[PDB]
Amino acid sequence: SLVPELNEKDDDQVQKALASRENTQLMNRIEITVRDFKTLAPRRWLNDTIIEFFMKYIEKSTPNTVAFNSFFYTNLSERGYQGVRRWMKRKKTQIDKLDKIFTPINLNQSHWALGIIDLKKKTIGYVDSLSNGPNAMSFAILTDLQKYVMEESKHTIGEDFDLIHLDCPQQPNGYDCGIYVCMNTLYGSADAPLDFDYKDAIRMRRFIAHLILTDALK
Template identity: 30%
Template sequence: MVFLPINIRKCHWYLSVINAKKREIQVLDSLGVGMGRSDLTMTLQGLDKHLKIACDMPEFKRGDRWQDLDIMNWTVVDKFQEPIQTDSASCGLFMLNCMEYWTGDILSDNFTQEDMKEFRRKLAVILLETELNKLKGSPIYYRTDNEENVSDNEENVSDSDVEFLEDRKRKRQDSHDGAEDKGPLRNPIMAVDPQDLVDELCNHIMSINDATSLE
């Protein structure tokens, strides 16, 4: 199977699955069958073009699982007839769950709109902790051109790039209500340790319920 995330006009994500065994284009759309599929058609046309180019390569091996490469003639099947998404902001989360649990026939695990609340927080942790995250544990890593005898594994953080969240919050509040200086800050987030800073930042972000403040 080939999993293709599809975006509709920069407003909605869904999953299309190229299932070679069944010769099907399987569509898993959290909003059901009400959305258009022109974006899928364009993606399939591009994939079909590249498959045809690949077939002309001498090193290309079709394999037993890809007997038919003419994907434009495969059947397109919508797997979700009814919406399972009830808000307007979770389509990407539903798509990732479909990629994880789709077996080619069924979902190996069920998930609902309510599950997306927890998965949204879980995904942030997954992205933060992955080994591919080169900024893990620090706001900014840098290495100057004139540094010598520094190993590739050493990671440095510039203190000038660290801002106390309480200070920023106070400035925003002062700007909003015209309040005067309230004196010393209380409990600023100190970068004692990169991981401690990340934990505090995550806690702070998850505590914000105002969309403008988050932006």
Template identity: 25%
Template sequence: MPVLHYHDVVLHAEDVASLDEGQWLTDSIIEFHMEYLERNHQTPGNDVVTLLRPGMVQLLSHTQEDVTALKPVLPPSLSTSQAVFMPINDGVPESAYSGSHWSLLVYLHQTQKCYHYDSIRDSNLDQARLTAQRLSSLLELPRPISVIPMACPQQTNGADCGVHVIALVDYFVRKIQETSDIETLVSVDSDEIAATSMVRKRLLSVIKDESHERKFLDQS
């Protein structure tokens, strides 16, 4: 039974349980976080930021069709917003449950480049490059999008990659409203990134507040 229906996102008990310390976040939690940011006006608008959901990123990266055929099912703001945020997963469609790592890819229209933030060095760099290649074709750019690996906080266990992605999205959504300087925008100040334990607790609190099944959550 679903724990929470939040607009287009459905969370189940296993999704909420993935917020416990030491657990690997489900893609539904990352999707919920993006949906919640947009719905609560914590993003500066689609003309500035597009938060591409995990499922959409996988579709873009691994479709066997011409990627331009995906335009009707992807956000129209993809080609107009200043920044596109894409959670990257190392899973492949032909192997169910094969994904084991999340990272964040950020595309800036001003530079026509992607910036890759990976909490386990460059583990997902190949996947990020594939997504950037597909995005370049989708946007029909005159040249391929280059991917620049960027420094960011590194995880200290095998489970916090998705939490790092959420913390980085929060950080950049704030930052893009504060500065237009590209060098400042793409760099990460580790002191301003929320601790993973706090990210987990905050999301759990938000889900509890939003849930019509609060009694179930309080007992879990």
């Protein structure tokens, strides 16, 4: 359900834009080129730009929810809290008012995974559609995200959060990570079980493409 099926007109609009001998803008509300857009074509690794678009979409379509772009985690891990100290303020809310915070993570510029800070359930989750199991990078992500919550909250929350590895549907190929993160973000945003399938994942490409072309961020 959560990932709708496009009608013929809407899908043909995606087709035509993908075949597009291309320009600059498809959107600018985050600047998206047709080149970035083409990353939503089948068999293609999704770039940071597209993931940023989806995170923004989720924010706009989900009350009490912050969904940072992929650069948040880079700055946090490389510069610590001090490197990301204004990011929440730019969201026009305070951490104590939130339900959840989504953090897409691009490990080694190749491997897309997801961090979910659930302030109501008091958990920090690591979600990976290419999971080997708990490893050093996942442990560091969880550590860093807790450190964030501890700092951002002026040391009022986070210290007692459960640091977990969240099972999710696993991908059948080596390039759909970006998409699985989007889906985990959507499903998580709806408090739905992570029980989507690979067929759902294919629809997601067309969905996000549609959202871009319809200027879904108004």
